[PDB]
Design a protein around this ligand. Structure first.
Ligand SMILES: [Mg+2]
Ligand SMILES: [Zn+2]
Ligand SMILES: [Zn+2]
Ligand SMILES: [Zn+2]
Lengths: 214, 192, 91, 133, 61, 257, 151
RNA sequence: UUAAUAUUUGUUUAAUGAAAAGUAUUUUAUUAUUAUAUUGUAUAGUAUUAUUAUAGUGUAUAGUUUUUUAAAAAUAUAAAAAUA
């Protein structure tokens, strides 16, 4: 995916980037032929466990979501694993096929929303809790830092309901800010390699790493 | 000898027609084409008893009478049907005739099923079905009450979910603060 | 061909060539819903992999079940909730 | 010539083995998919008990009253138990010349596969395909 | 006795076949994992004679 | 305007050239794409070797290409050799293209997805510096005694640029068909890809059991009952794999590393 | 195009006169439009970061040699010659569209548009007026029938 | 003599217990459990290693592993356009 040929010039997606994929500059006068645009074939994205779990975590964070702001929420999420809006749409389609999430339409705002199914909500909650525990185990801090974090968590728990909601809004906006800042220092490289299973079908194995950019 | 078999690129239907192996989820029609002493296909298990009997009894007491094709179509129109075929319906109706539940009277050119032997018990079963529908409505009212209870439980779930979101965002926040402190701690010390 | 999982009913489509005619009836494939190896059964028939001699690519074509299965997961009423996020035709 | 389709399509209503599954003569749990020792009789109905088809063990698909096989592989449900037609109609107990305490029936709905629900299920499902919407 | 023995033999054969298939699938997945590791270590990519710019263009898939 | 003296597509002789006259002629399928060529005796088609049907011919071609990609060479007989060489060229073309459609087409054609992966891994870097004719065909002076058919050694050209088969010697076969092939003294320290090494080790350990010795003696008995001569008695036969032979073969394999 | 082994003045004139058959081709269109630009050639050019006929025409002979004898593009010379031949009128099309505009004119364009919309409106006005006349005749028939019933 | 003949030509396996029949040198064929003498277990038939699944139970995804050949006529099958 390039900024000029697949999207209008000037736009850019704040997400994980593919490894060794050059972001080559495309001239402004570039245009596709009407017949050449039909025969364009895109590479398949990863709708696997990691992307579906990321999207399910975002959909559990925002209850419920809307298809318009879903990409904004995914970009604000710190550990984004999606490549672009096409990857997001493919992961949404895979979640719909698997039955994790359903798509409804609000008769008030005339917009499509993404709700979580009642049967899979328990598994989504389990996945979110496991991811939270993994992030807690991976995060490093000293004794005083851990004590301050525990005190802040206890204060947020003892706060009221609307107080907790305002605290969550402030926390998520500060998370968005710190993610936009940290993205300039490090990014997420997605690597892929095709292979063929025992059924003669071609599918890709994917790796996800983090690399510092200075 | 078949052109479809000699063709270099075989179709999926052509490859299906070669599924003569007696196996689970095989070509049932191609396995039935061979004789009964060759293929191990027993008789079709048709479930009879009160389960199809009461169903067809309700569906026939609703109309009183209907022809066999009309009864089959009206049954197939519904979603849950213990009957798999019109032949199954015919066997159930025949057993019911033998047990004196339905009786078939021939009109000028057709036969119609009626409930004359157990007409009192037929009305009793119809009233039982009506009371079952009333109990289903009462269960729907109880389900509205349980939906209010589930709205309370969902408010509790929203509380615990926002608490989990707070404890997660705080973890992501401290992780990003640690990363920014590792790279350039000036921004981390400015944010405190 | 179109296959369904024996345990959950998850369905995926993949054409079967002449080198996999033995695996047309039952496929041992990893299920994304069951998260493990499950047995897949043959549900509906697709056209073919190759081309019928002196016949177009459409011949023979998939059955009504395959065409209906696709139309429920990707179509007018299926992609409408997905055309608001990316509009797959574009990136 | 057989006049019945093969590989019944379950895209309208999938017929899968439930996770919890008991018998009709036994009311005891059965193996789900590891062993086909059970007998599945699907008809596409949620009617109690054991929706989308009940289940029987191979050894226990026999009549519950006389403890004998079935005549034409057709049992009669009687207040939760499976009886035979001579038992249900009230006739005398007839000992069969063939196998006594087991009936000729395939495993895993193989014998009840050629009849049941096929594609399309309803009439409104075909017009869904032939219409652009 | 014949009935029971035949059913038991077929069931045990089915179970052994299931175990064999499961083990072979696991071994093939491990094989693909090792192959991917070696390809990433040696710089080999099965994306053609071209470089990553073609895949970035993703005009051919 | 008028019509040619002979109208319609008329089958000409085997060595007759083209006519270049206006004739409404249709192709069965697009034969310009790799592995989709047609077989015939005209010049625009591959020489159709003898087979019971076009389906059987395509199956023979698929197994030929699979074994070719497997062991880097193949000794074939008759008209199968030109078809095998051209199909190997087509496989190399698909591998150098490296599209997902190319992967799927080679997977549809081949019998082994592991061989599909091996091809797409090795052949691009192996034939990056070659334009065409990636396979070499050599007509041997020895013929198959049974039917007196001409034998052909078909192989790939860039032997040294390959990851597998680097330094392999094909002047004489190995000691056993399950043992690794011969290696020249200069390339003794070469190393093979680990996935292919594990696959070969599994397939070779398949033959180290006693059930294989029983299959071997039973094949002796079958071919002796079927009238085939020069087949010794299963009492006189001896196993292909024994303990001391396996020990010395393991020593040689560790020497070749 | 065959070119028999080298691009000539006849081939350049061929490309020039065929440039009329592509009015929507701009100097910034994709490289797959150029003659003898196969998939291999297009992928190698995209590797070289060449997405445009302008960028093909701006190439050097040494770059063309690298693409032809080290990358594998056989007709790279033909693609480059086609680009260099057609690049000059494409710049004119992009800056002003001289050959496309001086022959029609905005005056004739607006005249055609206005006449088209007027004719399309007149086609429907004809049916409107004929239906009005039909309704008037129906009312006259009603009045005549009322008069005859009164008589 | 026909006869440089006709014919053969072994490169890819979808299925499960007897008895009649067949006696082919089963060297200790099996190695054991139970109990209790004695007796016997591998291979049809159509003049053959032949168009061949002997249908007595019983059910099933073990792929339960011998069919050459580089153009032609006539013949044999199968397909065979927007002509009728
Ligand atoms: Mg005989
Ligand atoms: Zn599943
Ligand atoms: Zn039971
Ligand atoms: Zn009974």
């Amino acid at each position: 995916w390039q900024s000029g040929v697949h999207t209008p010039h000037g736009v850019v997606y704040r997400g994980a980037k593919m490894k060794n994929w050059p972001e080559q500059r495309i001239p402004e006068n570039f245009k596709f032929t009407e017949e050449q645009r039909f025969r364009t074939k895109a590479i398949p994205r990863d709708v696997g466990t990691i992307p579906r779990n990321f999207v399910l975590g975002v959909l559990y964070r925002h209850q419920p979501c809307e298809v318009g702001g879903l990409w904004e929420h995914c970009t604000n999420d710190p550990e984004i694993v999606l490549d672009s809006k096409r990857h997001l749409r493919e992961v949404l389609k895979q979640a719909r096929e698997e039955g994790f999430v359903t798509f409804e339409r609000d008769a008030i705002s005339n917009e499509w929303l993404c709700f979580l199914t009642r049967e899979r909500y328990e598994e989504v909650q389990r996945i979110v809790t496991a991811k939270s525990e993994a992030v807690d185990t991976h995060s490093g801090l000293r004794g005083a830092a851990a004590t301050e974090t525990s005190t802040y968590a206890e204060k947020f728990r003892e706060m009221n309901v609307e107080a907790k909601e305002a605290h969550a809004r402030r926390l998520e906006e500060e998370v968005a800010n710190t993610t936009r800042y940290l993205r300039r220092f490090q990014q997420r490289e997605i690597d892929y390699l095709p292979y063929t299973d025992l059924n003669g079908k071609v599918n890709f194995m994917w790796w996800y790493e983090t690399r510092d950019v200075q | 000898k078949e052109y479809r078999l000699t063709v270099p690129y075989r179709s999926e239907v052509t490859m299906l027609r070669l599924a003569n192996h007696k196996a689970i989820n095989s070509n049932i029609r191609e396995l039935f084409k061979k004789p009964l002493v060759m293929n191990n296909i027993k008789a079709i298990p048709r479930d009879l008893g009160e389960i199809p009997r009461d169903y067809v009894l309700r569906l026939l007491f609703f109309h009183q009478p209907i022809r066999l094709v009309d009864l089959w179509t009206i049954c197939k129109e519904h979603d849950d049907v213990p009957l798999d075929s019109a032949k199954h319906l015919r066997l159930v109706l025949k057993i019911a005739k033998l047990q004196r539940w339905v009786y078939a009277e021939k009109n000028q050119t057709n036969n119609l099923y009626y409930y004359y032997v157990h007409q009192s018990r037929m009305q009793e079963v119809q009233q039982m079905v009506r009371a079952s529908e009333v109990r289903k409505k009462e269960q729907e009212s109880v389900r509205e009450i349980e939906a209010e209870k589930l709205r309370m439980e969902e408010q509790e779930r929203r509380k615990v979910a926002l608490d989990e979101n707070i404890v997660a965002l705080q973890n992501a926040l401290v992780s990003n603060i640690a990363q920014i402190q590792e790279f350039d701690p000036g921004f981390a010390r400015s944010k405190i | 061909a179109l296959f369904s999982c024996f345990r959950c009913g998850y369905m995926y489509e993949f054409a079967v060539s002449n080198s996999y005619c033995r695996k047309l009836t039952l496929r041992n494939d990893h299920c994304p819903r069951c998260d493990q190896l499950t047995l897949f059964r043959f549900m509906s028939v697709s056209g073919m992999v190759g081309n019928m001699p002196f016949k177009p690519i459409g011949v023979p074509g998939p059955s009504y079940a395959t065409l209906w299965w696709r139309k429920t997961r990707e179509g007018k009423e299926a992609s409408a909730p997905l055309d608001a996020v990316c509009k797959s035709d574009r990136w | 010539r057989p006049h019945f389709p093969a590989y019944n399509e379950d895209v309208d209503r999938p017929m899968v083995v439930p996770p919890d599954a008991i018998c009709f003569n036994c009311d005891k749990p059965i193996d789900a998919g590891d062993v086909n020792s059970y007998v599945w009789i699907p008809a596409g109905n949620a009617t109690v008990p054991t929706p989308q088809g009940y289940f029987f063990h191979f050894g226990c698909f026999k009549c519950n009253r006389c403890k004998y096989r079935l005549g034409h592989n057709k049992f009669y449900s009687k207040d939760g138990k499976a009886w035979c037609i001579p038992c249900a109609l009230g006739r005398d107990v007839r000992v069969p010349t063939r196998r006594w305490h087991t009936s000729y029936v395939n495993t895993h709905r193989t014998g009840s596969r050629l009849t049941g629900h096929f594609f399309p299920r309803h009439s409104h499902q075909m017009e869904f395909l032939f219409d652009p919407n | 006795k014949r009935i029971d023995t035949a059913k038991r033999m077929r069931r045990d054969r089915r179970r052994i076949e299931e175990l064999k298939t499961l083990e072979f699938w696991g071994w093939y997945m491990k094989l693909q994992r090792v192959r991917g590791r070696w390809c990433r270590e040696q710089g080999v990519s099965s994306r053609g004679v071209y470089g990553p710019a073609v895949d970035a263009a993703e005009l051919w898939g | 305007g008028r019509a040619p003296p002979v109208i319609g597509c008329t089958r000409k002789a085997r060595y007759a050239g083209i006519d270049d006259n206006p004739t409404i002629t249709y192709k069965p399928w697009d034969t310009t794409e790799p592995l989709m060529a047609d077989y015939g005796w005209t010049r625009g088609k591959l020489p159709k070797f003898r087979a019971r049907s076009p389906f059987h011919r395509q199956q023979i071609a698929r197994r030929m290409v699979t074994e070719m990609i497997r062991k880097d060479y193949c000794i074939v007989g008759g008209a199968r050799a030109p078809a095998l060489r051209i199909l190997a060229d087509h496989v190399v073309e698909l591998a150098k293209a490296g599209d997902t459609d190319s992967r799927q087409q080679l997977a549809y054609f081949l019998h082994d997805p592991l061989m599909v992966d091996k091809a797409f891994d090795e052949y691009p870097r192996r034939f990056k510096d070659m334009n065409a004719k990636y396979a070499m065909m050599t007509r041997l002076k020895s013929r198959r005694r049974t039917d007196a058919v001409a034998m052909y050694f078909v192989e790939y050209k860039n032997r040294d640029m390959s990851d597998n088969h680097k330094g392999e010697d094909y002047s004489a076969g190995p000691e056993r068909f399950f043992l690794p092939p011969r290696i020249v003294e200069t390339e003794k320290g070469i190393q093979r890809p680990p996935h292919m090494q594990m696959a070969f080790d599994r397939w070779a350990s398949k033959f180290k059991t006693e059930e294989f010795h029983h299959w071997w003696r039973l094949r002796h008995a079958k071919l002796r009952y079927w009238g085939v001569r020069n087949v010794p008695h299963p009492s006189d036969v001896d196993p292909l794999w024994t303990e001391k032979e396996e020990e010395e073969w393991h020593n040689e394999m560790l020497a070749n590393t | 195009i065959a070119t028999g082994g080298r691009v000539t003045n006849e081939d350049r004139r061929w490309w020039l006169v065929h440039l009329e058959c592509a009015p929507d081709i701009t100097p910034g269109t994709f490289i797959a439009w150029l003659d003898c630009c196969g998939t291999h050639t297009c992928k190698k050019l995209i590797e070289r970061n060449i997405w445009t006929i302008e960028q093909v025409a701006a190439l050097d002979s040494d770059q063309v040699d690298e693409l032809k004898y080290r990358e594998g593009c056989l007709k790279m010379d033909v693609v480059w010659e086609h680009a260099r031949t057609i690049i000059t009128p494409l710049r004119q099309r992009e800056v002003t569209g001289g050959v496309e505009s001086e022959l029609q004119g905005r005056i004739m364009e607006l005249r055609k548009k206005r006449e088209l919309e007027r004719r399309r409106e007149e086609i429907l006005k004809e049916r409107a007026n004929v239906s009005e006349q039909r309704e008037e005749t129906l009312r006259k028939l009603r009045e005549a029938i009322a008069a005859k019933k009164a008589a």
